[PDB]
Design a protein around this motif. Structure first.
Motif, PDB file in Angstrom:
ATOM      1  N   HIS A   1      17.436 -54.929 -55.617  1.00 54.89           N
ATOM      2  CA  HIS A   1      17.870 -54.794 -54.235  1.00 54.89           C
ATOM      3  C   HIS A   1      16.612 -54.759 -53.359  1.00 54.89           C
ATOM      4  O   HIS A   1      15.678 -53.997 -53.622  1.00 54.89           O
TER       5      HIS A   1
ATOM      6  N   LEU B   1      24.354 -60.626 -51.303  1.00 53.59           N
ATOM      7  CA  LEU B   1      24.803 -60.190 -50.003  1.00 53.59           C
ATOM      8  C   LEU B   1      23.600 -59.819 -49.152  1.00 53.59           C
ATOM      9  O   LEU B   1      22.671 -59.177 -49.630  1.00 53.59           O
TER      10      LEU B   1
ATOM     11  N   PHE C   1      22.804 -57.671 -45.706  1.00 56.25           N
ATOM     12  CA  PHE C   1      23.466 -56.779 -44.775  1.00 56.25           C
ATOM     13  C   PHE C   1      22.524 -55.924 -43.929  1.00 56.25           C
ATOM     14  O   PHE C   1      21.371 -55.668 -44.288  1.00 56.25           O
TER      15      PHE C   1
ATOM     16  N   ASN D   1      22.551 -52.455 -41.392  1.00 54.76           N
ATOM     17  CA  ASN D   1      23.295 -51.283 -40.926  1.00 54.76           C
ATOM     18  C   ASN D   1      22.726 -50.824 -39.588  1.00 54.76           C
ATOM     19  O   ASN D   1      21.641 -50.214 -39.513  1.00 54.76           O
TER      20      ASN D   1
ATOM     21  N   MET E   1      25.513 -59.281 -55.575  1.00 50.26           N
ATOM     22  CA  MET E   1      26.923 -58.936 -55.601  1.00 50.26           C
ATOM     23  C   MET E   1      27.446 -58.997 -57.032  1.00 50.26           C
ATOM     24  O   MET E   1      26.779 -59.526 -57.922  1.00 50.26           O
TER      25      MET E   1
ATOM     26  N   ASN F   1      28.152 -53.186 -38.455  1.00 52.76           N
ATOM     27  CA  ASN F   1      27.613 -53.663 -39.718  1.00 52.76           C
ATOM     28  C   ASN F   1      27.517 -55.170 -39.679  1.00 52.76           C
ATOM     29  O   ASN F   1      28.378 -55.829 -39.102  1.00 52.76           O
TER      30      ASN F   1
ATOM     31  N   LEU G   1      27.200 -58.535 -42.238  1.00 54.94           N
ATOM     32  CA  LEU G   1      27.261 -59.033 -43.593  1.00 54.94           C
ATOM     33  C   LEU G   1      27.114 -60.531 -43.604  1.00 54.94           C
ATOM     34  O   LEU G   1      27.756 -61.247 -42.836  1.00 54.94           O
TER      35      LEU G   1
ATOM     36  N   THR H   1      26.626 -63.981 -46.257  1.00 50.18           N
ATOM     37  CA  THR H   1      26.518 -64.660 -47.537  1.00 50.18           C
ATOM     38  C   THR H   1      26.391 -66.144 -47.236  1.00 50.18           C
ATOM     39  O   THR H   1      26.549 -66.557 -46.077  1.00 50.18           O
TER      40      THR H   1
ATOM     41  N   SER I   1      27.331 -51.032 -44.780  1.00 47.76           N
ATOM     42  CA  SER I   1      27.732 -52.444 -44.774  1.00 47.76           C
ATOM     43  C   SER I   1      28.589 -52.885 -45.961  1.00 47.76           C
ATOM     44  O   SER I   1      29.492 -53.690 -45.792  1.00 47.76           O
ATOM     45  N   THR I   2      28.277 -52.393 -47.158  1.00 47.49           N
ATOM     46  CA  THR I   2      28.912 -52.856 -48.391  1.00 47.49           C
ATOM     47  C   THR I   2      30.394 -52.558 -48.394  1.00 47.49           C
ATOM     48  O   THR I   2      31.199 -53.355 -48.855  1.00 47.49           O
TER      49      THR I   2
ATOM     50  N   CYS J   1      32.898 -55.424 -47.241  1.00 41.35           N
ATOM     51  CA  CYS J   1      33.375 -56.462 -48.167  1.00 41.35           C
ATOM     52  C   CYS J   1      34.110 -55.860 -49.409  1.00 41.35           C
ATOM     53  O   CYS J   1      34.468 -56.573 -50.357  1.00 41.35           O
TER      54      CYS J   1
ATOM     55  N   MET K   1      32.955 -52.948 -51.335  1.00 42.40           N
ATOM     56  CA  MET K   1      32.128 -52.324 -52.340  1.00 42.40           C
ATOM     57  C   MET K   1      31.829 -50.907 -51.946  1.00 42.40           C
ATOM     58  O   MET K   1      31.008 -50.657 -51.059  1.00 42.40           O
TER      59      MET K   1
END
Ligand SMILES: Nc1ncnc2c1ncn2[C@@H]1O[C@H](COP(=O)(O)OP(=O)(O)OP(=O)(O)OP(=O)(O)OC[C@H]2O[C@@H](n3cnc4c(N)ncnc43)[C@H](O)[C@@H]2O)[C@@H](O)[C@H]1O
Length: 296
Positions: free
Chosen positions: A89, A133, A135, A137, A156, A230, A232, A234, A258-259, A262, A264
């Protein structure tokens, strides 16, 4: 031009940092869930180590620095996340201090996409399960615990289909003018704004990302007109979620960044996990609590 051999660079950098004790991977377990009410897929990650937990990018430790500059300009550093759940990450952080409440430059969004592209050489959605992903915040309510601008890039999961995908299925890339605004899934409870992107990056320039963002940001801004959202991103699409609270109400009280949006969800507490697992729709209700009513 953005650095090449990037993925090898991050990976090599990562094992080294892990090996050397400079960053610690949060131990975690994840399982799929299906919202029985809304159909939405959820990817739930249990990390109780985190329940322990109650500008770091100023002078980053050298061992966490993947590249001291990213493009020709002195604009960007790429950093390893120092406390990752998902391995490798990373962080796209402005060379100079720029606010976490600041909106993304067109080059912000444009540099991001390239990083995405370094990472997935494409060849198909139907070839590899690798996927990523991006993202951001933004603002007190967004999940941001940090004030320096940072775009986050993370793998992801391999078999997971966030609702955005199904939303953009079919659905040629476009920009809102009159007929269809940015796409919004009417089944879920929370306001969010999405647009597909060209299947070919060939067609993706700092101009299109810029326009997509701004328009999404236009619709998400009306939820005020304090300010938090947020972002996001992709290869397949881009999303913006207006945001009200960083932390959900009574049933669960999840910290969602953010996660979440989608699907998560990072859970730090067993009971809550067990609650979610028993009744996945509560995730959807939490997303409402941290967000704003779905306007579709
Ligand atoms: N000295 C340093 N060097 C390098 N990086 C530093 C650093 N100090 C802080 N950071 C990192 O820089 C980022 C800062 O961005 P922020 O926007 O400020 O904060 P955040 O990503 O929401 O993480 P936070 O720390 O606030 O809380 P959480 O429990 O959700 O954190 C959980 C972690 O898992 C991630 N995460 C959240 N939800 C997830 C999900 N559903 N699945 C997988 N990962 C998830 C988060 O991004 C976060 O990384 C983070 O990645 C943070 O780790």
């Amino acid at each position: 031009m953005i650095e090449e051999n990037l993925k090898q660079k991050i990976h090599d950098k990562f094992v080294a940092a892990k090996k050397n004790g400079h960053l610690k991977v949060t131990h975690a377990e994840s399982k799929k869930l299906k919202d029985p009410q809304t159909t939405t897929q959820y990817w739930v990650t249990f990390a109780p180590s985190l329940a322990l937990k109650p500008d770091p990018f100023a002078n980053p430790d050298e061992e966490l620095v993947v590249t001291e500059d990213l493009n020709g300009d002195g604009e960007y550093k790429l950093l390893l996340n120092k406390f990752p759940v998902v391995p490798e990450h990373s962080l796209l952080v402005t060379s100079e201090f720029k606010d976490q409440r600041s909106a993304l430059t067109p080059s912000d969004l444009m540099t991001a996409y390239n990083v995405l592209c370094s990472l997935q050489g494409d060849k198909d959605d139907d070839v590899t399960c690798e996927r990523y992903l991006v993202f951001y915040n933004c603002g007190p309510h967004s999940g941001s615990s940090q004030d320096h601008k940072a775009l986050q890039i993370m793998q992801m999961p391999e078999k997971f289909i966030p609702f955005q995908d199904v939303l953009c299925n079919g659905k040629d890339h476009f920009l809102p003018t009159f007929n269809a605004e940015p796409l919004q899934d009417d089944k879920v409870s929370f306001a969010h704004f999405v647009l597909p992107l060209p299947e070919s990056s060939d067609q993706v320039d700092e101009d299109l990302l810029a326009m997509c963002y701004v328009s999404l940001m236009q619709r998400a801004l009306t939820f005020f007109q304090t300010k938090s959202y947020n972002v996001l991103l992709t290869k397949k699409w881009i999303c913006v979620v207006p945001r009200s609270h960083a932390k959900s109400g009574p049933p669960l009280m999840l910290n969602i960044n953010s996660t979440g949006y989608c699907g998560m969800i990072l859970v730090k507490d067993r009971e809550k996990l067990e609650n979610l697992t028993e009744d996945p729709h509560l995730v959807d209700k939490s997303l409402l609590q941290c967000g704003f009513p779905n306007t579709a």
